[PDB]
Scaffold this motif. Structure first.
Motif, PDB file in Angstrom:
ATOM      1  N   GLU A 108      11.901   5.250 -19.625  1.00  0.00           N
ATOM      2  CA  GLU A 108      11.847   6.544 -20.286  1.00  0.00           C
ATOM      3  C   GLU A 108      11.812   7.691 -19.291  1.00  0.00           C
ATOM      4  OE1 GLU A 108       8.566   6.431 -22.916  1.00  0.00           O
ATOM      5  OE2 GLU A 108       9.422   4.843 -24.172  1.00  0.00           O
ATOM      6  N   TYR A 109      11.983   7.390 -17.996  1.00  0.00           N
ATOM      7  CA  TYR A 109      12.351   8.352 -16.951  1.00  0.00           C
ATOM      8  C   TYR A 109      11.242   9.372 -16.717  1.00  0.00           C
ATOM      9  CZ  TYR A 109      16.690   6.027 -17.618  1.00  0.00           C
ATOM     10  OH  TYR A 109      17.654   5.065 -17.741  1.00  0.00           O
ATOM     11  N   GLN A 110      10.006   8.884 -16.747  1.00  0.00           N
ATOM     12  CA  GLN A 110       8.826   9.719 -16.599  1.00  0.00           C
ATOM     13  C   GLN A 110       8.064   9.416 -15.319  1.00  0.00           C
ATOM     14  OE1 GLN A 110       6.912   9.087 -20.303  1.00  0.00           O
ATOM     15  NE2 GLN A 110       6.867   6.859 -20.104  1.00  0.00           N
ATOM     16  N   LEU A 111       8.715   8.777 -14.362  1.00  0.00           N
ATOM     17  CA  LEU A 111       8.365   8.707 -12.958  1.00  0.00           C
ATOM     18  C   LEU A 111       9.438   9.410 -12.142  1.00  0.00           C
ATOM     19  CD1 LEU A 111       7.031   5.084 -12.644  1.00  0.00           C
ATOM     20  CD2 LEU A 111       5.804   7.134 -12.083  1.00  0.00           C
ATOM     21  N   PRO A 112       9.117   9.884 -10.935  1.00  0.00           N
ATOM     22  CA  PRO A 112      10.161  10.464 -10.083  1.00  0.00           C
ATOM     23  C   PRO A 112      11.172   9.417  -9.652  1.00  0.00           C
ATOM     24  CG  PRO A 112       8.019  11.224  -9.403  1.00  0.00           C
ATOM     25  CD  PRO A 112       7.775  10.138 -10.385  1.00  0.00           C
ATOM     26  N   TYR A 113      12.445   9.785  -9.720  1.00  0.00           N
ATOM     27  CA  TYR A 113      13.541   8.839  -9.548  1.00  0.00           C
ATOM     28  C   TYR A 113      13.980   8.893  -8.091  1.00  0.00           C
ATOM     29  CZ  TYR A 113      17.540   6.032 -10.980  1.00  0.00           C
ATOM     30  OH  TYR A 113      18.457   5.024 -11.139  1.00  0.00           O
ATOM     31  N   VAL A 114      13.636   7.843  -7.347  1.00  0.00           N
ATOM     32  CA  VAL A 114      13.880   7.809  -5.915  1.00  0.00           C
ATOM     33  C   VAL A 114      15.159   7.026  -5.621  1.00  0.00           C
ATOM     34  CG1 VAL A 114      12.619   7.369  -3.729  1.00  0.00           C
ATOM     35  CG2 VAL A 114      11.396   7.955  -5.798  1.00  0.00           C
ATOM     36  N   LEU A 115      15.728   6.376  -6.629  1.00  0.00           N
ATOM     37  CA  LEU A 115      16.997   5.700  -6.432  1.00  0.00           C
ATOM     38  C   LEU A 115      18.128   6.724  -6.399  1.00  0.00           C
ATOM     39  CD1 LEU A 115      16.492   2.730  -8.914  1.00  0.00           C
ATOM     40  CD2 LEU A 115      15.739   2.946  -6.530  1.00  0.00           C
ATOM     41  N   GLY A 116      19.279   6.297  -5.900  1.00  0.00           N
ATOM     42  CA  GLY A 116      20.380   7.222  -5.761  1.00  0.00           C
ATOM     43  C   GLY A 116      20.252   8.194  -4.614  1.00  0.00           C
ATOM     44  N   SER A 117      19.421   7.888  -3.619  1.00  0.00           N
ATOM     45  CA  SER A 117      19.261   8.713  -2.432  1.00  0.00           C
ATOM     46  C   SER A 117      19.695   7.987  -1.168  1.00  0.00           C
ATOM     47  CB  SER A 117      17.811   9.173  -2.304  1.00  0.00           C
ATOM     48  OG  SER A 117      17.437   9.986  -3.400  1.00  0.00           O
ATOM     49  N   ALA A 118      20.461   6.898  -1.321  1.00  0.00           N
ATOM     50  CA  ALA A 118      21.036   6.097  -0.233  1.00  0.00           C
ATOM     51  C   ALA A 118      19.964   5.540   0.702  1.00  0.00           C
ATOM     52  CB  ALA A 118      22.093   6.880   0.549  1.00  0.00           C
ATOM     53  N   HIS A 119      18.997   4.832   0.127  1.00  0.00           N
ATOM     54  CA  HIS A 119      17.942   4.245   0.932  1.00  0.00           C
ATOM     55  C   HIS A 119      18.218   2.781   1.242  1.00  0.00           C
ATOM     56  CE1 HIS A 119      15.307   7.675   1.003  1.00  0.00           C
ATOM     57  NE2 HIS A 119      15.308   7.759  -0.314  1.00  0.00           N
ATOM     58  N   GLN A 120      17.614   2.327   2.330  1.00  0.00           N
ATOM     59  CA  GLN A 120      17.657   0.941   2.744  1.00  0.00           C
ATOM     60  C   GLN A 120      16.802   0.093   1.806  1.00  0.00           C
ATOM     61  OE1 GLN A 120      16.341   1.037   6.763  1.00  0.00           O
ATOM     62  NE2 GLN A 120      18.194   2.021   7.542  1.00  0.00           N
ATOM     63  N   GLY A 121      16.959  -1.221   1.902  1.00  0.00           N
ATOM     64  CA  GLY A 121      16.155  -2.109   1.094  1.00  0.00           C
ATOM     65  C   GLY A 121      16.751  -2.473  -0.240  1.00  0.00           C
ATOM     66  N   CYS A 122      18.070  -2.441  -0.364  1.00  0.00           N
ATOM     67  CA  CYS A 122      18.734  -2.891  -1.576  1.00  0.00           C
ATOM     68  C   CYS A 122      18.891  -4.410  -1.507  1.00  0.00           C
ATOM     69  CB  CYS A 122      20.074  -2.180  -1.722  1.00  0.00           C
ATOM     70  SG  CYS A 122      19.956  -0.389  -1.661  1.00  0.00           S
ATOM     71  N   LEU A 123      19.620  -4.985  -2.461  1.00  0.00           N
ATOM     72  CA  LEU A 123      20.022  -6.374  -2.335  1.00  0.00           C
ATOM     73  C   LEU A 123      20.998  -6.505  -1.167  1.00  0.00           C
ATOM     74  CD1 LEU A 123      20.940  -7.278  -6.036  1.00  0.00           C
ATOM     75  CD2 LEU A 123      18.700  -7.455  -5.022  1.00  0.00           C
ATOM     76  N   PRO A 124      20.947  -7.610  -0.429  1.00  0.00           N
ATOM     77  CA  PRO A 124      21.849  -7.786   0.713  1.00  0.00           C
ATOM     78  C   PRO A 124      23.285  -7.986   0.262  1.00  0.00           C
ATOM     79  CG  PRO A 124      19.898  -9.128   0.957  1.00  0.00           C
ATOM     80  CD  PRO A 124      19.877  -8.620  -0.436  1.00  0.00           C
ATOM     81  N   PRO A 125      24.264  -7.733   1.144  1.00  0.00           N
ATOM     82  CA  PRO A 125      25.659  -8.018   0.779  1.00  0.00           C
ATOM     83  C   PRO A 125      25.945  -9.494   0.620  1.00  0.00           C
ATOM     84  CG  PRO A 125      25.534  -6.516   2.635  1.00  0.00           C
ATOM     85  CD  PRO A 125      24.174  -7.064   2.451  1.00  0.00           C
ATOM     86  N   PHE A 126      25.171 -10.350   1.266  1.00  0.00           N
ATOM     87  CA  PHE A 126      25.474 -11.756   1.341  1.00  0.00           C
ATOM     88  C   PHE A 126      24.432 -12.548   0.569  1.00  0.00           C
ATOM     89  CE2 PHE A 126      25.687 -15.810   3.786  1.00  0.00           C
ATOM     90  CZ  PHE A 126      26.984 -16.122   3.448  1.00  0.00           C
ATOM     91  N   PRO A 127      24.848 -13.445  -0.334  1.00  0.00           N
ATOM     92  CA  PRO A 127      23.905 -14.067  -1.278  1.00  0.00           C
ATOM     93  C   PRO A 127      22.865 -14.983  -0.658  1.00  0.00           C
ATOM     94  CG  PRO A 127      26.137 -14.198  -2.101  1.00  0.00           C
ATOM     95  CD  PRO A 127      26.244 -13.741  -0.692  1.00  0.00           C
ATOM     96  N   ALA A 128      23.056 -15.452   0.569  1.00  0.00           N
ATOM     97  CA  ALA A 128      22.095 -16.348   1.192  1.00  0.00           C
ATOM     98  C   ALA A 128      20.961 -15.613   1.892  1.00  0.00           C
ATOM     99  CB  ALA A 128      22.801 -17.264   2.190  1.00  0.00           C
ATOM    100  N   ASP A 129      20.975 -14.286   1.901  1.00  0.00           N
ATOM    101  CA  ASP A 129      19.975 -13.517   2.619  1.00  0.00           C
ATOM    102  C   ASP A 129      18.778 -13.210   1.730  1.00  0.00           C
ATOM    103  OD1 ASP A 129      21.552 -13.486   4.895  1.00  0.00           O
ATOM    104  OD2 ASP A 129      22.510 -11.586   4.368  1.00  0.00           O
ATOM    105  N   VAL A 130      17.597 -13.244   2.337  1.00  0.00           N
ATOM    106  CA  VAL A 130      16.339 -12.954   1.662  1.00  0.00           C
ATOM    107  C   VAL A 130      15.931 -11.545   2.064  1.00  0.00           C
ATOM    108  CG1 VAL A 130      13.941 -13.638   1.345  1.00  0.00           C
ATOM    109  CG2 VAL A 130      15.707 -15.370   1.645  1.00  0.00           C
ATOM    110  N   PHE A 131      15.605 -10.710   1.086  1.00  0.00           N
ATOM    111  CA  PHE A 131      15.286  -9.328   1.389  1.00  0.00           C
ATOM    112  C   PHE A 131      13.823  -9.034   1.067  1.00  0.00           C
ATOM    113  CE2 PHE A 131      15.066  -7.064  -2.695  1.00  0.00           C
ATOM    114  CZ  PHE A 131      15.501  -8.049  -3.545  1.00  0.00           C
TER     115      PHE A 131
END
Lengths: 103, 103
Positions: free
Chosen positions: B25-48
């Motif tokens: 319901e968008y009632q926290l500050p939205y920190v996504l969409g700011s190009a930050h590190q720590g997303c899912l890895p490009p490669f499926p065998a990697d643990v993040f």
């Protein structure tokens, strides 16, 4: 740009006018228009009833918010109130932006 | 995980939970969409590693403003998950235009 609601079809103009009541015409015919009228004015009451739609707030904000308040400190005159001469005055402009919302 | 003076020992804790909620319901500050590190890895065998959540608020220098909102995230309903439990939600994207993938 002065603030408000831009309306392609705004509330219409309400135009009002006393009907001219002439004084006594000459007992012979004159093709000139009347320049002599009975001096008169009108009075009455006017009512406007607007329905406004509200938009309630859904903030998950923890700390308290800035709100418009009156001060409790004493004064010779209460704000937004007539004085001893019966003159109503508004002390300050009240804007509408007091609650908050995240971008 | 227990540090006892020479060697890290890691054991299971079966009766321990993990709190998960979605801010749908968008009632926290939205920190996504700011190009930050720590997303899912490009490669499926990697643990993040899951990044720490943090938000910025209004400032006057390094100090705070009266309109600065503090958000407790244990003030939301969250689902508590032991081993055996799972979390799931769905989401429907709104009508967005096609991204023009041509020259």
């Amino acid at each position: 740009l002065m603030g408000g609601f831009g309306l392609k079809h705004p509330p219409p103009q309400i135009l009002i006018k006393n009907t001219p009541v002439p004084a006594n015409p000459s007992t012979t015919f004159s093709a000139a228009k009347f320049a002599s009228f009975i001096t008169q004015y009108s009075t009455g009451q006017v009512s406007v009833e607007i329905e406004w739609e509200l938009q309630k707030e859904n903030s998950k904000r923890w700390n308290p918010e800035i709100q418009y308040t009156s001060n409790y400190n004493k004064s010779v005159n209460v704000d937004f109130t007539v004085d001893t001469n019966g003159v109503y005055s508004e002390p300050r402009p009240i804007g509408t932006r007091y609650l908050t919302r995240n971008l | 995980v227990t540090q006892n003076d020479g060697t890290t020992t890691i054991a299971n804790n079966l009766t321990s939970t993990v709190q998960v909620f979605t801010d749908s319901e968008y009632q926290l500050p939205y920190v996504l969409g700011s190009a930050h590190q720590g997303c899912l890895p490009p490669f499926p065998a990697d643990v993040f590693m899951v990044p720490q959540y943090g938000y910025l608020t209004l400032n006057n220098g390094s100090q705070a403003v009266g309109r600065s909102s503090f958000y407790c995230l244990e003030y939301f309903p969250s689902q508590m998950l032991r081993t055996g439990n799972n979390f799931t939600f769905s989401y429907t994207f709104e009508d967005v235009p096609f991204h023009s993938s041509y020259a």
